[PDB]
């Protein structure tokens, strides 16, 4: 029975529905499930005031404000501020009850409902760890994790040290193997394999030991990219099998400890570091008290054997033939199978929802593609035309918004355009027509337009199941230019800057060179373009190789005439900046020489900033720890006081504006500074 030892079951158990139902309801020890439940509840309680935004609710949902919001459905609307505070209080109470084990099911539902309401409220706050938290809560709702180490067993002698069915562990293990597998099968994209996604991450001081035997570019290519891909692909297989459990445990622990320091992703690292002992035997907490001293073995509950439970089906050779499974067992097995199948299918569902497919497939948040695509934005321009007088005006990019993610998605752009159309008449404007002009470069590519600048987005057509028509395709046959682009960028001085631009045929770019931008020029790399000077009306044609100098403080237009896309570049110098720095350096040198035998203020304040940085470097870590603890305490206290204020207002009523001002001023006292 080698396969029976490797997998824990036999092939004959899967030959019938009855046998599978019996196998999936096998009795199991509940200790690991209890430990994971406690840790997850504690982490959620710590996370609610920080990342979910309980300490910024007054700023975000201030009553009577002109804000554009981006919900998944426009039928979903937020409530007043006090009801937001009530919803967050209910979610916090549910998380606390889930952690303690007191009223497990009610607390699970109380955490689950408002969390998903808040999640669906805004599309601009979706990431992968929030989705994972929602999924874990949904799974834990249907399990019985209060059968060990819980308050629910103290006031009920029927759920204390009882068996649990096997699928309770199978569902969680299957989930943690989809995170790591579907995350390294998405890192088999040419930009991750070639080493373009995270090129500057190897400069961290945590990678210094690797530099003793590898070069910097080799460290970036091998350790960061290929090592990460291999770990993601093989972690689940390493953890599942007991022959290689220790090595896999050490590797994933080191990986998550590194990721907790490199990035700022909330509690993702700590959550996935507590979900890896759910692959070890379900009795590890029971065995871990046998190594602690026997002096401390008396205050903990006596380690007895688990007591029978009605949740799991019992099949014994001598202990009767067995009972026919009821509805509970069949429902559990069906839930396990269907949930795992749907979780496998969902990340590859992008061929159905074609309306959410931009340059990158789908909405961000549920596909397990972390740190693969990076974006850089060069210029954003919003222009509206009055529908009555025909006047042309320009709006400040991102006026009534609280995020910046609307620049990459067509649905968010449509929502923003509709919000602006509804809000503009309040500022003495008739019905507007709004056009957008956004330049984006993805993974160190040429900058190009992502949306058509000739299309009025207010009257455009968008559907969830239809491919958008006004989205410009990514110029994929220009990536092999990146080596030459990097060489050109490196072969520069300490004062010049370079911008790379690729333009579609039939469109033109209008630019206004600032006064301080003396000595600016345009050089053509491919195709053919014509440059027109607005002041002195004349066209000039360019060929591959030549360059032309442009004046300062004047409008110039670049027209693309080649049948194929053409690319050029900009070289400009800040004459005022270099003159200021050179005169500052000359004056500082002269003053230093004189002493030893507002520009000065700027130099002195920069020196003061450098001195503060070096003093913080020299000082030990305990002051930093004290400051970090003080900031966390301040945020917790502020959230608690505002929640109490809003709860009092809801229960009794608004006392007076003066008292409200006094309590609000009290709530931001900064306890110790």
């Amino acid at each position: 029975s080698r396969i029976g030892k490797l997998l824990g079951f036999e092939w004959t158990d899967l030959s019938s529905w009855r046998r599978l139902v019996t196998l999936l309801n096998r009795p199991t020890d509940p200790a690991s499930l209890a430990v994971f439940r406690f840790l997850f509840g504690f982490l959620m309680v710590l996370d609610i005031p920080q990342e979910r935004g309980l300490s910024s609710l007054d700023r975000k949902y201030l009553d009577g404000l002109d804000v554009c919001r981006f919900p998944l459905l426009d039928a979903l609307r937020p409530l007043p501020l006090d009801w937001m505070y009530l919803v967050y209080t209910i979610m916090f109470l549910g998380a606390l009850g889930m952690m303690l084990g007191l009223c497990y099911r009610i607390s699970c539902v109380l955490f689950l409902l408002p969390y998903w309401y808040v999640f669906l409220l805004d599309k601009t706050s979706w990431n992968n760890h929030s989705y994972l938290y929602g999924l874990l809560a949904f799974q834990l709702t249907f399990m019985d994790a209060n059968h060990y180490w819980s308050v629910d067993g103290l006031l009920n002698a029927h759920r204390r040290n009882a068996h649990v069915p096997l699928w309770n562990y199978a569902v969680l293990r299957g989930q943690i193997f989809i995170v790591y597998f579907i995350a390294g099968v998405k890192k088999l994209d040419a930009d991750w394999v070639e080493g373009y996604s995270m090129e500057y991450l190897s400069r961290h001081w945590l990678f210094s030991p690797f530099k003793l035997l590898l070069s910097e570019e080799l460290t970036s290519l091998l350790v960061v990219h290929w090592g990460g891909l291999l770990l993601d692909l093989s972690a689940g297989f390493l953890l599942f099998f007991d022959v290689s459990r220790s090595i896999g445990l050490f590797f994933v622990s080191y990986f998550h400890c590194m990721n907790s320091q490199l990035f700022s992703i909330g509690m993702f690292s700590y959550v996935m570091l507590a979900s890896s002992p759910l692959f070890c035997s379900p009795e590890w907490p029971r065995k871990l008290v046998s190594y602690c001293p026997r002096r401390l073995q008396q205050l903990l509950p006596l380690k007895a054997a688990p007591q029978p439970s009605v949740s799991c089906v019992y099949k014994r050779s001598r202990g009767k033939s067995g009972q026919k499974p009821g509805l509970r067992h069949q429902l559990g097995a069906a839930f396990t199978l269907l949930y795992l199948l749907e979780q496998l299918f969902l990340p590859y569902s992008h061929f159905l929802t074609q309306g959410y497919n931009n340059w990158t497939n789908g909405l961000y948040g549920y596909s397990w593609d972390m740190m693969v695509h990076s974006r850089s934005h060069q210029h954003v321009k919003i222009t509206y035309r009055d529908g009555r007088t025909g006047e042309l005006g320009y709006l400040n990019p991102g006026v009534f918004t609280q995020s910046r993610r609307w620049k990459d998605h067509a649905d968010m752009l449509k929502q923003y355009a509709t919000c602006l159309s509804r809000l503009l008449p309040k500022y003495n404007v008739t019905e507007p027509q709004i056009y957008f002009d956004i330049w984006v470069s993805i993974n160190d590519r040429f900058q190009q337009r992502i949306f058509d600048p000739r299309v009025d987005i207010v009257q455009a057509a968008w559907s969830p199941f239809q491919r958008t028509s006004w989205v410009q395709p990514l110029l994929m046959d220009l990536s092999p230019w990146r080596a030459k682009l990097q060489e050109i960028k490196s072969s520069l001085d300490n004062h010049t800057e370079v911008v790379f631009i690729a333009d579609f045929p039939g469109l033109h770019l209008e630019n206004f060179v600032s006064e301080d931008l003396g000595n600016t020029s345009i050089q053509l790399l491919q195709g053919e373009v014509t440059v027109e000077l607005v002041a002195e009306q004349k066209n000039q044609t360019l060929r591959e190789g030549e360059k032309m100098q442009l004046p300062a403080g004047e409008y110039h237009k670049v027209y693309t005439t080649s049948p194929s896309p053409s690319c050029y570049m900009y070289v400009y110098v800040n004459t005022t900046e270099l003159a200021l720095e050179q005169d500052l350096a000359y004056l500082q040198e002269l003053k230093e020489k004189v002493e030893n035998g507002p520009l000065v203020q700027t130099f002195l304040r920069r020196q003061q900033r450098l001195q503060e940085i070096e003093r913080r470097r020299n000082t030990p870590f305990h002051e930093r720890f004290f400051r970090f603890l003080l900031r966390k305490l301040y945020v917790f206290r502020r959230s608690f006081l505002m929640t109490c204020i809003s709860l009092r207002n809801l229960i009794l009523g608004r006392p007076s504006l003066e008292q409200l001002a006094q309590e609000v001023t009290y709530a931001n006292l900064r306890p110790f500074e």
Binding site: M371, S374, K381, Y427
Partner: peptide
């Protein structure tokens, strides 16, 4: 405080990941 002019709007010559909060 939400309107620009042609001069400031047309100035072109002046990386991030969506997982970090």
């Amino acid at each position: 405080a939400n309107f620009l002019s042609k001069q400031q709007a047309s100035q072109v010559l002046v990386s991030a990941l969506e997982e970090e909060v």
